[PDB]
Amino acid sequence: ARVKRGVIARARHKKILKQAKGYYGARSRVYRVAFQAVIKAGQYAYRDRRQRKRQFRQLWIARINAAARQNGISYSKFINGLKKASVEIDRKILADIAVFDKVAFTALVEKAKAA
Amino acid sequence: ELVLKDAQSALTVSETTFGRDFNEALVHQVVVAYAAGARQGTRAQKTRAEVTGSGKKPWRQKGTGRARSGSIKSPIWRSGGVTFAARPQDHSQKVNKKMYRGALKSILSELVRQDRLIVVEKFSVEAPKTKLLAQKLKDMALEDVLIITGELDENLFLAARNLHKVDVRDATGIDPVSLIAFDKVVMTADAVKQVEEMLA
């Protein structure tokens, strides 16, 4: 028996165009172009789930290095000082304590000074 | 044995034919085969050979900027094509004698456990009238049935064409899908004697 394939096409195109919804020019409107944009977007989305973790880790270290040199220590010594006193606090939090509770960040720099 | 509903006589029915285990694969195969045998398979499209058009190359190979063609009957053109046009074909398939018999035995054995099978004595309507047949199913307390008889009375047949949930047959003409499809089944003591002796 014959199968008209008109209902199903638009179903699977509309799925894709709805993902491209937002893109500039044809990349939004036109299926052929959108399909590529949607896939490349996926590739990048996958690729940057990895880079998200790196970028933030740089960004924290920068904050900590800045915050330490206010108190008079370079990051490399500050981390080695913390690790030598078996301190387990990660970068993410150190970058938060750097910004927020500077009285608490000061005491970490003393805690690290011992070693 | 199988006791009757208006006698209580000990019918010594065979154990090897009716007391059997169900075999779903075989039954499925036979019931599929029976359906597939019901196809007539009358249908045809027409390939680029049989389409009504010229042989002529519409335009020459090179020179023109268009995409090389050599037919207005080719499947990638609007009008004329269907790459793989079906021909009228025989969809029926072989089922082995013993497979078929075994399936009928297997489905006819299951009705004893389901209690769909109703065995009866002298079952016959008085005259060719649906009014009687329709009323006499209420006393027996049935509805969607397959009546099977050895001594095929014309009176019973005539007045069961228009009745849809009833289907009358001869014991000779029992089927795989027919026994399975209908909810209840009605068999005469002669009919079961004939089926028992036929299947063996």
């Binding site: - | 779903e24 499925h28 195969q29 399975i180 499809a181």
Partner: protein
């Protein structure tokens, strides 16, 4: 109940359908490589073609001849001996039971398995191992 019926496990195998996307595994070239005579529609090569090298069935020499007498002789198995008429199995009576084909003048009983009743064979060739058995059952040949 008609809709309840399902086949056996591994009975139906779906079947390969070619050219239907990437996820299908096979698709774009229906499991038939890139290019060459084998990939082309109506491709491949005739039976016994080793690419211009003289094929095995021509470099080897032909031998023998088909005998006409070999087609009209049969090898009767001793197990199918006593399945006719008491113990009389000449040729036509053996032929009547559909043990050997019609146009078969000569025939020969060989050893195989089991004799119970005494069988007198006559007008028929018999094998030494069978003759020991047929006599050991009881029946005398000719």
């Amino acid at each position: 109940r008609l809709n309840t019926l399902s086949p056996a496990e591994g009975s139906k195998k779906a079947g390969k359908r070619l050219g239907r996307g990437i996820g299908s595994g096979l698709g774009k070239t229906g499991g038939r490589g890139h290019k060459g005579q084998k990939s082309r529609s109506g491709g491949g090569v005739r039976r016994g073609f080793e690419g211009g090298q003289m094929p095995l069935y021509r470099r080897l020499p032909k031998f023998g001849f088909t005998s006409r007498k070999a087609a009209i002789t049969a090898e009767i198995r001793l197990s199918d001996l006593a399945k006719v008429e008491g113990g009389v199995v000449d040729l036509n009576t053996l032929k009547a039971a559909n043990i050997i084909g019609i146009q078969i003048e000569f025939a020969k009983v060989i050893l195989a398995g089991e004799v119970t009743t005494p069988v007198t064979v006559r007008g028929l060739r018999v094998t030494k191992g069978a003759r020991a058995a047929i006599e050991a059952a009881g029946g005398k040949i000719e």
